[PDB]
């Protein structure tokens, strides 16, 4: 046991909600299209990757007596007798994203989801965590909650608990982008556009002055008029005016592009995926996105699962439509291994997502020799 | 024993925390998003690399009697009876990053984590280190704590104690970038936009003047108007004004890009990882990131581990999704090695992350000979 | 940073002058205002001022890049290692760094 755990409790007795302003985040996700699309692709991608359970670690875990097949079916087919697999996975991933942490309940035989927007974790004076408090009055325990924590540095010191919300960091950038974009719309709806100013030093009958004003407006526009010369009489003067604040000054494109690139940067999506990319970009960018962004996100979940159940669980995609291996190269390398005897044919079948055959000559290596 | 160790202790009796301002760093991590993404990539990438324990060094280390398999389980499956593997690695790496150093406690059988933001190291007049003081009154020892130090040159002389926090070098750049970015939104919300400036040397009825100023603004906006000509009567003049301080002057984009490269440079992540890259950019840049940045960072940890336990521990990834070898090239070199008899087939499978199979012909080198 | 410089050759009650200054500031900003034309009465003029020392003059970026290259030069680290490199850039530069430095 850790002799310094009680000081850890004293320095942070309870978890801290990190999505400091939730309503602004919800408003932006609802009515801002870069956050909407980026969060949607991240969550949907973290919902397509299947989980493959491995061997049993001969250790004591919080959940014991669960067989491999039951865990596999509840984790890849249907978690709860009442809820979907993709819905539950998306809920967990969106809790991990929009909130710092993500929480999953564990019944006797079913694996329920609990939102992290209301749960608060209370540290223990002795071990690691005393008891979770969902909103209030729940008081789950610890053996029945799967804890997913995204790394955080909140307040002075990092925390054994809680988590820092990825979406909560882009709120300032989203507000800046929205204000900067609304400024152009209001500038267009407000700024005045004129084509000609005439001046006279004597008052000339406001009614008739206005009538001549619309006469000049309609008559000297090539779409609706067929005149191009003015003969000003009586000393009326034409002031050579200029435009005060032209639209060319408001060059917000570069700043808006910077804000968009930053927002795509925080979630981790490459900018090429949202745009159109060449053949040299699409496959490497899909690989970079999925692996280096999502697979940490799912690795947190799978590590928490292998802590909770003791079964080695890893994010093994091998089936997502975005990372389907190149058929020619994959076939070439699998055939090379099969011919040269490194792997059996059945393993190649398993890699090709086929089903192994109960054949004799395939279950043993070829060993070409001669 | 070192004759000069007492002078070393006299020149620096105790360690000193190097993250001089923790709260500003926390607020930057929580509300500045380039820093969030860079730190998250570094920490998560430093949490995916598995650890392989090698042989036993016949030396007297601080931890004795620990079995190889028990150390492997503690270091790759479950460090604690109460906390995860990914969470533990993430805490250790974020302590190494945001603070200068990182500390890991060691019970008889459990390998607990302790924060480095609170704990101070006291040098020894004779050997190396008297003890470790966690805030106070705990007073761990040295025989039971694992010490991971990031190289530092603080004050006049470099220290065998303490350490330099990489993030603390970035706070000034973060403040500069935040101020520079806030200046643009404040300039937009504060600057004035004018369409016309009409003057008269005599007073024209403020109420009716304001009514005409609303009518004249709404009438000459082509979105909401059907007039474009002015007939100024009574001697009212139109001053040919010009915009005083246009927005085109504030060319902050290059400065903000410089500050973004500022933020990313200190952590070590290449700028291509954040953006999109070609076939020739993604995998080489991920290789640079992992190797050059992370693997020294985990090499500090593994060197401290091999000091503590005496077992050769190295960061052996071989499984991280972002460094999966090219299937075709990997197949080609493995098959060539197997055919030409340099390595056995079983160790080829081992390098393929599969399970070696107990065969008679495969356990020996093929020896092509003819 | 200034938007307007309106001038008057007579004194006009500092308190209300400041009040109208604030009102005309807030009114003629499209973000927080819904007006774009200004009618000046009483002989008040509008001086066509200009920006004295614009931020565009301070082009420090090239000098700052030179200083960064100079700092990275003394230690020996190639500039490609810190940035992103292609297949042709990255491994020869890692080799040059390790070996030569």
PDB file of N, CA and C in Angstrom, chain B residues 112-195:
ATOM      1  N   UNK B 112       3.569   1.304  -7.309  1.00  0.00           N
ATOM      2  CA  UNK B 112       2.652   2.440  -7.278  1.00  0.00           C
ATOM      3  C   UNK B 112       3.277   3.687  -7.885  1.00  0.00           C
ATOM      4  N   UNK B 113       2.422   4.606  -8.323  1.00  0.00           N
ATOM      5  CA  UNK B 113       2.859   5.902  -8.828  1.00  0.00           C
ATOM      6  C   UNK B 113       2.671   6.985  -7.776  1.00  0.00           C
ATOM      7  N   UNK B 114       3.585   7.951  -7.766  1.00  0.00           N
ATOM      8  CA  UNK B 114       3.474   9.116  -6.893  1.00  0.00           C
ATOM      9  C   UNK B 114       3.728  10.375  -7.714  1.00  0.00           C
ATOM     10  N   UNK B 115       2.961  11.445  -7.510  1.00  0.00           N
ATOM     11  CA  UNK B 115       3.176  12.664  -8.294  1.00  0.00           C
ATOM     12  C   UNK B 115       4.519  13.301  -7.981  1.00  0.00           C
ATOM     13  N   UNK B 116       5.111  13.920  -8.998  1.00  0.00           N
ATOM     14  CA  UNK B 116       6.388  14.600  -8.849  1.00  0.00           C
ATOM     15  C   UNK B 116       6.242  16.088  -8.575  1.00  0.00           C
ATOM     16  N   UNK B 117       5.023  16.621  -8.633  1.00  0.00           N
ATOM     17  CA  UNK B 117       4.826  18.041  -8.373  1.00  0.00           C
ATOM     18  C   UNK B 117       4.951  18.370  -6.894  1.00  0.00           C
ATOM     19  N   UNK B 118       4.766  17.380  -6.025  1.00  0.00           N
ATOM     20  CA  UNK B 118       4.756  17.603  -4.589  1.00  0.00           C
ATOM     21  C   UNK B 118       6.020  17.129  -3.891  1.00  0.00           C
ATOM     22  N   UNK B 119       6.774  16.216  -4.493  1.00  0.00           N
ATOM     23  CA  UNK B 119       7.845  15.546  -3.775  1.00  0.00           C
ATOM     24  C   UNK B 119       9.197  16.170  -4.095  1.00  0.00           C
ATOM     25  N   UNK B 120      10.005  16.340  -3.052  1.00  0.00           N
ATOM     26  CA  UNK B 120      11.320  16.953  -3.131  1.00  0.00           C
ATOM     27  C   UNK B 120      12.373  15.898  -2.839  1.00  0.00           C
ATOM     28  N   UNK B 121      13.536  16.028  -3.469  1.00  0.00           N
ATOM     29  CA  UNK B 121      14.629  15.079  -3.296  1.00  0.00           C
ATOM     30  C   UNK B 121      15.742  15.757  -2.512  1.00  0.00           C
ATOM     31  N   UNK B 122      16.240  15.077  -1.484  1.00  0.00           N
ATOM     32  CA  UNK B 122      17.323  15.586  -0.658  1.00  0.00           C
ATOM     33  C   UNK B 122      18.589  14.791  -0.939  1.00  0.00           C
ATOM     34  N   UNK B 123      19.682  15.496  -1.212  1.00  0.00           N
ATOM     35  CA  UNK B 123      20.938  14.834  -1.523  1.00  0.00           C
ATOM     36  C   UNK B 123      21.568  14.258  -0.260  1.00  0.00           C
ATOM     37  N   UNK B 124      22.583  13.422  -0.461  1.00  0.00           N
ATOM     38  CA  UNK B 124      23.299  12.773   0.628  1.00  0.00           C
ATOM     39  C   UNK B 124      24.723  13.300   0.691  1.00  0.00           C
ATOM     40  N   UNK B 125      25.193  13.560   1.910  1.00  0.00           N
ATOM     41  CA  UNK B 125      26.559  14.037   2.082  1.00  0.00           C
ATOM     42  C   UNK B 125      27.575  12.974   1.698  1.00  0.00           C
ATOM     43  N   UNK B 126      27.164  11.710   1.649  1.00  0.00           N
ATOM     44  CA  UNK B 126      28.093  10.622   1.379  1.00  0.00           C
ATOM     45  C   UNK B 126      27.807   9.894   0.078  1.00  0.00           C
ATOM     46  N   UNK B 127      26.601   9.348  -0.107  1.00  0.00           N
ATOM     47  CA  UNK B 127      26.449   8.399  -1.207  1.00  0.00           C
ATOM     48  C   UNK B 127      25.899   9.000  -2.496  1.00  0.00           C
ATOM     49  N   UNK B 128      24.585   9.224  -2.569  1.00  0.00           N
ATOM     50  CA  UNK B 128      24.006  10.026  -3.643  1.00  0.00           C
ATOM     51  C   UNK B 128      22.872  10.898  -3.119  1.00  0.00           C
ATOM     52  N   UNK B 129      22.009  10.296  -2.305  1.00  0.00           N
ATOM     53  CA  UNK B 129      20.707  10.863  -1.963  1.00  0.00           C
ATOM     54  C   UNK B 129      20.313  10.343  -0.589  1.00  0.00           C
ATOM     55  N   UNK B 130      20.015  11.259   0.330  1.00  0.00           N
ATOM     56  CA  UNK B 130      19.617  10.847   1.672  1.00  0.00           C
ATOM     57  C   UNK B 130      18.251  10.178   1.657  1.00  0.00           C
ATOM     58  N   UNK B 131      17.312  10.922   1.092  1.00  0.00           N
ATOM     59  CA  UNK B 131      15.983  10.450   1.125  1.00  0.00           C
ATOM     60  C   UNK B 131      15.104  11.240   0.285  1.00  0.00           C
ATOM     61  N   UNK B 132      13.857  10.851   0.213  1.00  0.00           N
ATOM     62  CA  UNK B 132      12.862  11.542  -0.599  1.00  0.00           C
ATOM     63  C   UNK B 132      11.753  12.036   0.318  1.00  0.00           C
ATOM     64  N   UNK B 133      11.391  13.312   0.189  1.00  0.00           N
ATOM     65  CA  UNK B 133      10.373  13.897   1.057  1.00  0.00           C
ATOM     66  C   UNK B 133       9.125  14.266   0.258  1.00  0.00           C
ATOM     67  N   UNK B 134       8.041  13.523   0.480  1.00  0.00           N
ATOM     68  CA  UNK B 134       6.784  13.762  -0.222  1.00  0.00           C
ATOM     69  C   UNK B 134       5.988  14.816   0.540  1.00  0.00           C
ATOM     70  N   UNK B 135       6.018  16.051   0.041  1.00  0.00           N
ATOM     71  CA  UNK B 135       5.633  17.230   0.809  1.00  0.00           C
ATOM     72  C   UNK B 135       6.481  17.255   2.070  1.00  0.00           C
ATOM     73  N   UNK B 136       6.003  16.607   3.127  1.00  0.00           N
ATOM     74  CA  UNK B 136       6.810  16.312   4.304  1.00  0.00           C
ATOM     75  C   UNK B 136       6.256  15.044   4.943  1.00  0.00           C
ATOM     76  N   UNK B 137       6.877  14.647   6.053  1.00  0.00           N
ATOM     77  CA  UNK B 137       6.477  13.676   7.075  1.00  0.00           C
ATOM     78  C   UNK B 137       6.353  12.251   6.539  1.00  0.00           C
ATOM     79  N   UNK B 138       6.258  12.076   5.222  1.00  0.00           N
ATOM     80  CA  UNK B 138       6.248  10.729   4.656  1.00  0.00           C
ATOM     81  C   UNK B 138       7.652  10.144   4.684  1.00  0.00           C
ATOM     82  N   UNK B 139       8.567  10.795   3.964  1.00  0.00           N
ATOM     83  CA  UNK B 139       9.999  10.509   4.003  1.00  0.00           C
ATOM     84  C   UNK B 139      10.289   9.073   3.553  1.00  0.00           C
ATOM     85  N   UNK B 140      10.101   8.854   2.247  1.00  0.00           N
ATOM     86  CA  UNK B 140      10.108   7.521   1.649  1.00  0.00           C
ATOM     87  C   UNK B 140      11.358   6.704   1.959  1.00  0.00           C
ATOM     88  N   UNK B 141      12.491   7.076   1.348  1.00  0.00           N
ATOM     89  CA  UNK B 141      13.824   6.487   1.518  1.00  0.00           C
ATOM     90  C   UNK B 141      14.668   6.731   0.276  1.00  0.00           C
ATOM     91  N   UNK B 142      14.794   5.695  -0.557  1.00  0.00           N
ATOM     92  CA  UNK B 142      15.603   5.680  -1.774  1.00  0.00           C
ATOM     93  C   UNK B 142      15.637   4.243  -2.269  1.00  0.00           C
ATOM     94  N   UNK B 143      15.660   3.295  -1.332  1.00  0.00           N
ATOM     95  CA  UNK B 143      15.629   1.879  -1.662  1.00  0.00           C
ATOM     96  C   UNK B 143      14.275   1.429  -2.191  1.00  0.00           C
ATOM     97  N   UNK B 144      13.231   2.237  -2.020  1.00  0.00           N
ATOM     98  CA  UNK B 144      11.872   1.842  -2.371  1.00  0.00           C
ATOM     99  C   UNK B 144      11.229   2.768  -3.394  1.00  0.00           C
ATOM    100  N   UNK B 145      11.982   3.690  -3.986  1.00  0.00           N
ATOM    101  CA  UNK B 145      11.428   4.665  -4.915  1.00  0.00           C
ATOM    102  C   UNK B 145      12.238   4.639  -6.203  1.00  0.00           C
ATOM    103  N   UNK B 146      11.547   4.759  -7.328  1.00  0.00           N
ATOM    104  CA  UNK B 146      12.178   4.786  -8.639  1.00  0.00           C
ATOM    105  C   UNK B 146      12.275   6.238  -9.086  1.00  0.00           C
ATOM    106  N   UNK B 147      13.460   6.644  -9.533  1.00  0.00           N
ATOM    107  CA  UNK B 147      13.747   8.036  -9.841  1.00  0.00           C
ATOM    108  C   UNK B 147      13.996   8.192 -11.333  1.00  0.00           C
ATOM    109  N   UNK B 148      13.250   9.092 -11.966  1.00  0.00           N
ATOM    110  CA  UNK B 148      13.371   9.363 -13.392  1.00  0.00           C
ATOM    111  C   UNK B 148      13.606  10.854 -13.562  1.00  0.00           C
ATOM    112  N   UNK B 149      14.780  11.216 -14.072  1.00  0.00           N
ATOM    113  CA  UNK B 149      15.209  12.606 -14.145  1.00  0.00           C
ATOM    114  C   UNK B 149      15.390  13.024 -15.595  1.00  0.00           C
ATOM    115  N   UNK B 150      14.820  14.170 -15.947  1.00  0.00           N
ATOM    116  CA  UNK B 150      15.057  14.798 -17.237  1.00  0.00           C
ATOM    117  C   UNK B 150      16.194  15.799 -17.082  1.00  0.00           C
ATOM    118  N   UNK B 151      17.111  15.810 -18.050  1.00  0.00           N
ATOM    119  CA  UNK B 151      18.344  16.575 -17.894  1.00  0.00           C
ATOM    120  C   UNK B 151      18.041  18.054 -17.705  1.00  0.00           C
ATOM    121  N   UNK B 152      18.792  18.694 -16.813  1.00  0.00           N
ATOM    122  CA  UNK B 152      18.519  20.072 -16.443  1.00  0.00           C
ATOM    123  C   UNK B 152      19.814  20.845 -16.273  1.00  0.00           C
ATOM    124  N   UNK B 153      19.751  22.133 -16.600  1.00  0.00           N
ATOM    125  CA  UNK B 153      20.793  23.103 -16.279  1.00  0.00           C
ATOM    126  C   UNK B 153      20.066  24.279 -15.638  1.00  0.00           C
ATOM    127  N   UNK B 154      19.859  24.198 -14.327  1.00  0.00           N
ATOM    128  CA  UNK B 154      19.111  25.204 -13.581  1.00  0.00           C
ATOM    129  C   UNK B 154      20.074  25.942 -12.667  1.00  0.00           C
ATOM    130  N   UNK B 155      19.904  27.255 -12.573  1.00  0.00           N
ATOM    131  CA  UNK B 155      20.808  28.127 -11.815  1.00  0.00           C
ATOM    132  C   UNK B 155      22.197  28.018 -12.451  1.00  0.00           C
ATOM    133  N   UNK B 156      23.250  28.179 -11.650  1.00  0.00           N
ATOM    134  CA  UNK B 156      24.594  28.189 -12.199  1.00  0.00           C
ATOM    135  C   UNK B 156      25.043  26.862 -12.779  1.00  0.00           C
ATOM    136  N   UNK B 157      24.780  25.761 -12.076  1.00  0.00           N
ATOM    137  CA  UNK B 157      25.374  24.475 -12.406  1.00  0.00           C
ATOM    138  C   UNK B 157      24.296  23.442 -12.689  1.00  0.00           C
ATOM    139  N   UNK B 158      24.625  22.496 -13.567  1.00  0.00           N
ATOM    140  CA  UNK B 158      23.742  21.368 -13.806  1.00  0.00           C
ATOM    141  C   UNK B 158      23.642  20.508 -12.552  1.00  0.00           C
ATOM    142  N   UNK B 159      22.505  19.838 -12.409  1.00  0.00           N
ATOM    143  CA  UNK B 159      22.185  19.111 -11.194  1.00  0.00           C
ATOM    144  C   UNK B 159      21.994  17.633 -11.493  1.00  0.00           C
ATOM    145  N   UNK B 160      22.589  16.790 -10.653  1.00  0.00           N
ATOM    146  CA  UNK B 160      22.262  15.371 -10.641  1.00  0.00           C
ATOM    147  C   UNK B 160      20.889  15.110 -10.041  1.00  0.00           C
ATOM    148  N   UNK B 161      20.229  16.153  -9.542  1.00  0.00           N
ATOM    149  CA  UNK B 161      18.920  16.066  -8.913  1.00  0.00           C
ATOM    150  C   UNK B 161      17.988  16.977  -9.702  1.00  0.00           C
ATOM    151  N   UNK B 162      16.728  17.073  -9.274  1.00  0.00           N
ATOM    152  CA  UNK B 162      15.740  17.947  -9.895  1.00  0.00           C
ATOM    153  C   UNK B 162      15.447  17.515 -11.323  1.00  0.00           C
ATOM    154  N   UNK B 163      15.525  18.453 -12.259  1.00  0.00           N
ATOM    155  CA  UNK B 163      15.146  18.187 -13.629  1.00  0.00           C
ATOM    156  C   UNK B 163      14.493  19.398 -14.256  1.00  0.00           C
ATOM    157  N   UNK B 164      14.442  19.452 -15.582  1.00  0.00           N
ATOM    158  CA  UNK B 164      13.893  20.597 -16.293  1.00  0.00           C
ATOM    159  C   UNK B 164      12.605  20.202 -17.001  1.00  0.00           C
ATOM    160  N   UNK B 165      11.537  20.945 -16.730  1.00  0.00           N
ATOM    161  CA  UNK B 165      10.247  20.675 -17.342  1.00  0.00           C
ATOM    162  C   UNK B 165      10.196  21.279 -18.737  1.00  0.00           C
ATOM    163  N   UNK B 166       9.903  20.442 -19.732  1.00  0.00           N
ATOM    164  CA  UNK B 166       9.830  20.927 -21.106  1.00  0.00           C
ATOM    165  C   UNK B 166       8.695  21.927 -21.284  1.00  0.00           C
ATOM    166  N   UNK B 167       7.564  21.697 -20.615  1.00  0.00           N
ATOM    167  CA  UNK B 167       6.405  22.562 -20.802  1.00  0.00           C
ATOM    168  C   UNK B 167       6.684  23.960 -20.265  1.00  0.00           C
ATOM    169  N   UNK B 168       7.439  24.056 -19.167  1.00  0.00           N
ATOM    170  CA  UNK B 168       7.727  25.357 -18.572  1.00  0.00           C
ATOM    171  C   UNK B 168       8.493  26.271 -19.516  1.00  0.00           C
ATOM    172  N   UNK B 169       9.180  25.713 -20.512  1.00  0.00           N
ATOM    173  CA  UNK B 169       9.876  26.534 -21.493  1.00  0.00           C
ATOM    174  C   UNK B 169       8.926  27.144 -22.515  1.00  0.00           C
ATOM    175  N   UNK B 170       7.649  26.746 -22.500  1.00  0.00           N
ATOM    176  CA  UNK B 170       6.711  27.130 -23.547  1.00  0.00           C
ATOM    177  C   UNK B 170       5.682  28.143 -23.060  1.00  0.00           C
ATOM    178  N   UNK B 171       5.696  28.487 -21.772  1.00  0.00           N
ATOM    179  CA  UNK B 171       4.636  29.324 -21.214  1.00  0.00           C
ATOM    180  C   UNK B 171       4.719  30.747 -21.752  1.00  0.00           C
ATOM    181  N   UNK B 172       5.932  31.279 -21.923  1.00  0.00           N
ATOM    182  CA  UNK B 172       6.059  32.620 -22.483  1.00  0.00           C
ATOM    183  C   UNK B 172       5.527  32.675 -23.908  1.00  0.00           C
ATOM    184  N   UNK B 173       5.838  31.661 -24.717  1.00  0.00           N
ATOM    185  CA  UNK B 173       5.304  31.612 -26.073  1.00  0.00           C
ATOM    186  C   UNK B 173       3.787  31.483 -26.058  1.00  0.00           C
ATOM    187  N   UNK B 174       3.251  30.697 -25.125  1.00  0.00           N
ATOM    188  CA  UNK B 174       1.803  30.564 -25.011  1.00  0.00           C
ATOM    189  C   UNK B 174       1.151  31.897 -24.668  1.00  0.00           C
ATOM    190  N   UNK B 175       1.730  32.632 -23.718  1.00  0.00           N
ATOM    191  CA  UNK B 175       1.184  33.935 -23.352  1.00  0.00           C
ATOM    192  C   UNK B 175       1.259  34.909 -24.520  1.00  0.00           C
ATOM    193  N   UNK B 176       2.391  34.921 -25.228  1.00  0.00           N
ATOM    194  CA  UNK B 176       2.528  35.795 -26.389  1.00  0.00           C
ATOM    195  C   UNK B 176       1.473  35.483 -27.438  1.00  0.00           C
ATOM    196  N   UNK B 177       1.287  34.198 -27.754  1.00  0.00           N
ATOM    197  CA  UNK B 177       0.330  33.828 -28.788  1.00  0.00           C
ATOM    198  C   UNK B 177      -1.091  34.157 -28.356  1.00  0.00           C
ATOM    199  N   UNK B 178      -1.422  33.913 -27.086  1.00  0.00           N
ATOM    200  CA  UNK B 178      -2.764  34.228 -26.609  1.00  0.00           C
ATOM    201  C   UNK B 178      -3.043  35.723 -26.680  1.00  0.00           C
ATOM    202  N   UNK B 179      -2.083  36.551 -26.262  1.00  0.00           N
ATOM    203  CA  UNK B 179      -2.279  37.995 -26.343  1.00  0.00           C
ATOM    204  C   UNK B 179      -2.411  38.450 -27.791  1.00  0.00           C
ATOM    205  N   UNK B 180      -1.561  37.918 -28.675  1.00  0.00           N
ATOM    206  CA  UNK B 180      -1.615  38.309 -30.078  1.00  0.00           C
ATOM    207  C   UNK B 180      -2.929  37.900 -30.730  1.00  0.00           C
ATOM    208  N   UNK B 181      -3.470  36.737 -30.364  1.00  0.00           N
ATOM    209  CA  UNK B 181      -4.737  36.301 -30.938  1.00  0.00           C
ATOM    210  C   UNK B 181      -5.915  37.074 -30.360  1.00  0.00           C
ATOM    211  N   UNK B 182      -5.872  37.399 -29.064  1.00  0.00           N
ATOM    212  CA  UNK B 182      -6.941  38.195 -28.474  1.00  0.00           C
ATOM    213  C   UNK B 182      -6.948  39.615 -29.022  1.00  0.00           C
ATOM    214  N   UNK B 183      -5.784  40.118 -29.437  1.00  0.00           N
ATOM    215  CA  UNK B 183      -5.738  41.462 -30.001  1.00  0.00           C
ATOM    216  C   UNK B 183      -6.595  41.567 -31.253  1.00  0.00           C
ATOM    217  N   UNK B 184      -6.645  40.510 -32.067  1.00  0.00           N
ATOM    218  CA  UNK B 184      -7.445  40.578 -33.288  1.00  0.00           C
ATOM    219  C   UNK B 184      -8.935  40.671 -32.982  1.00  0.00           C
ATOM    220  N   UNK B 185      -9.441  39.833 -32.072  1.00  0.00           N
ATOM    221  CA  UNK B 185     -10.864  39.908 -31.757  1.00  0.00           C
ATOM    222  C   UNK B 185     -11.204  41.227 -31.077  1.00  0.00           C
ATOM    223  N   UNK B 186     -10.308  41.739 -30.229  1.00  0.00           N
ATOM    224  CA  UNK B 186     -10.582  43.024 -29.596  1.00  0.00           C
ATOM    225  C   UNK B 186     -10.557  44.158 -30.612  1.00  0.00           C
ATOM    226  N   UNK B 187      -9.651  44.087 -31.591  1.00  0.00           N
ATOM    227  CA  UNK B 187      -9.611  45.090 -32.647  1.00  0.00           C
ATOM    228  C   UNK B 187     -10.877  45.048 -33.487  1.00  0.00           C
ATOM    229  N   UNK B 188     -11.384  43.849 -33.771  1.00  0.00           N
ATOM    230  CA  UNK B 188     -12.627  43.741 -34.530  1.00  0.00           C
ATOM    231  C   UNK B 188     -13.812  44.277 -33.736  1.00  0.00           C
ATOM    232  N   UNK B 189     -13.907  43.924 -32.452  1.00  0.00           N
ATOM    233  CA  UNK B 189     -15.040  44.371 -31.648  1.00  0.00           C
ATOM    234  C   UNK B 189     -14.924  45.837 -31.261  1.00  0.00           C
ATOM    235  N   UNK B 190     -13.749  46.438 -31.431  1.00  0.00           N
ATOM    236  CA  UNK B 190     -13.549  47.818 -31.013  1.00  0.00           C
ATOM    237  C   UNK B 190     -13.442  48.785 -32.180  1.00  0.00           C
ATOM    238  N   UNK B 191     -12.866  48.358 -33.300  1.00  0.00           N
ATOM    239  CA  UNK B 191     -12.691  49.254 -34.424  1.00  0.00           C
ATOM    240  C   UNK B 191     -14.013  49.704 -35.012  1.00  0.00           C
ATOM    241  N   UNK B 192     -13.967  50.855 -35.678  1.00  0.00           N
ATOM    242  CA  UNK B 192     -15.152  51.484 -36.232  1.00  0.00           C
ATOM    243  C   UNK B 192     -15.175  51.324 -37.745  1.00  0.00           C
ATOM    244  N   UNK B 193     -16.383  51.248 -38.294  1.00  0.00           N
ATOM    245  CA  UNK B 193     -16.603  51.157 -39.731  1.00  0.00           C
ATOM    246  C   UNK B 193     -17.537  52.284 -40.145  1.00  0.00           C
ATOM    247  N   UNK B 194     -17.130  53.052 -41.152  1.00  0.00           N
ATOM    248  CA  UNK B 194     -17.875  54.214 -41.615  1.00  0.00           C
ATOM    249  C   UNK B 194     -18.137  54.063 -43.105  1.00  0.00           C
ATOM    250  N   UNK B 195     -19.322  54.483 -43.540  1.00  0.00           N
ATOM    251  CA  UNK B 195     -19.629  54.510 -44.954  1.00  0.00           C
ATOM    252  C   UNK B 195     -19.530  55.901 -45.545  1.00  0.00           C
TER     253      UNK B 195
END
